[PDB]
Amino acid sequence: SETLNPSARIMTFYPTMEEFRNFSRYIAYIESQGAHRAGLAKVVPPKEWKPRASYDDIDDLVIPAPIQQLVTGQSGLFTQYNIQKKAMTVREFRKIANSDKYCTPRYSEFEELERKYWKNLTFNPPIYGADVNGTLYEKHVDEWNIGRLRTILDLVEKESGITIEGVNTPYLYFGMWKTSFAWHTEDMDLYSINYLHFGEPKSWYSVPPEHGKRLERLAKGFFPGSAQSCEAFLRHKMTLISPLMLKKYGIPFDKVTQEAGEFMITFPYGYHAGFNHGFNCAESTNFATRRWIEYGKQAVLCSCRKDMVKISMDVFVRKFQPERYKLWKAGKDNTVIDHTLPTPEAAEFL
């Protein structure tokens, strides 16, 4: 376990069509290769795979709650404030995104675009067509369908009827240049799948789950007010920290750029952040493996906010940890998580 991906670098996978067909099995496989150690992995689907025939019929799709992203800060430390704007179609969004005021600046290397992002982050607040309920997958697509992955996370809706928008349902994200996703782990420290349907790239930063607590200590020191009001303030998804600040305080991290037609997998307790290069569309949801259950049980949740995502772990412990159920209910389950260990389903690849 502590022998596979010892550098904990972001890994990229190129599955065959046969490998790609079984979603859960392929997650088990990439974990047997140590992909989870970085907290983030890229999966390039087979060349002949397409989730939709064309994206020429979606300009009339409504973005019910577009978000203007106001960013305040200096010296690589920032807080993002969301200003909800009026409903707009993808049509109206693509116009504003590709306009002279909001379009991508001219650049050669990614390092130049990255530098311009961290330099101009607080100027000309962009609009993010975020958290749009829906899928762009065609009903017949059975491989990696974000709308129906069929992992154990389905036990939440199957047993309780509870649907959590974007968590056990898909979300669509219409981006423009300089739109950001702040430093965070998933709700309940779950996995996530992200597919870039079309457009300009999405760049990502990732902190290995092995070093997540170090990132939290750093953030707590930089925003002591926030940390005092809520232990899990990073779950508010308002905190932006430049890679130079991470480098300066010895926090290990890696970076990757996701192109259209590529998937990104985030792993339990994997801190990630990033930005969009220009106009694009991404689809995402959360998912689980048997390895996630312990992460769900130990997840430090946001106290201070109402409507914060909290999944009852009871059904998972009863079904997959019956021998530890009574101990866990009594608050005596003292299991320590080994972030290097792959999911039990990977046993066949080890």
Ligand X SMILES: O=C(O)c1ccnc(-c2cc[nH]n2)c1
Positions marked catalytic: 166, 173, 184, 186, 272, 284
DSSP, residue by residue, 179-235: -EEEEEPPGGG-EEEEEEEEES-EEEEEE-GGGHHHHHHHHHHH-HHHHHH-TTGGG
Q: Which stretch binds Cl ion (CB under 5 A): 120-128, 234-242, 267-275, 333-341?
A: 234-242
Q: How far is the CB of 189 from Zn ion (least distance, A)?
A: 15
Closer residue to ligand X (CB): 142 or 165? 165
Q: Cα torsion for 80, 84, 85, 91, to the nearest 10°?
A: 80
Residue 8 DSSP label: -
Smallest CA-to-CA distance from 25 within 143, 141, 168 is with 143
103 is in an annotated binding site: no
Is 234 one of the binding residues for Cl ion (CB under 5 A)? Answer: yes
Is 273 one of the binding residues for Cl ion (CB under 5 A)? Answer: no
Tokens of 18: 């046969």
CB 46 within 8 A of CB 20: yes
Q: Can you give the binding site for ligand X, defined by CB under 6 A?
A: 130, 173, 181, 186, 192, 194, 202, 282
Closer residue to ligand X (CB): 67 or 246? 67
Which of ligand X, Zn ion, Ni ion, none has residue 242 at its interface (CB below 5 to 8 Å by kind)? Answer: none
Closer residue to ligand X (CB): 168 or 192? 192
Q: How far is the CB of 190 from ligand X (least distance, A)?
A: 9
Q: Can you give the binding site for Zn ion, defined by CB under 5 A?
A: 230, 302, 304-305
Residue type, 122: T
Q: Which stretch binds Ni ion (CB under 5 A): 135-143, 188-196, 306-314, 342-350?
A: 188-196
Contact partners, residue 161, CB within 8 Å, separation at least 6: none
Q: How far is the CB of 273 from ligand X (least distance, A)?
A: 8
Tell me phi and psi for residue 147, to 5 degrees. -75, -20
The contact set with Cl ion (CB under 5 A) reads 232-234
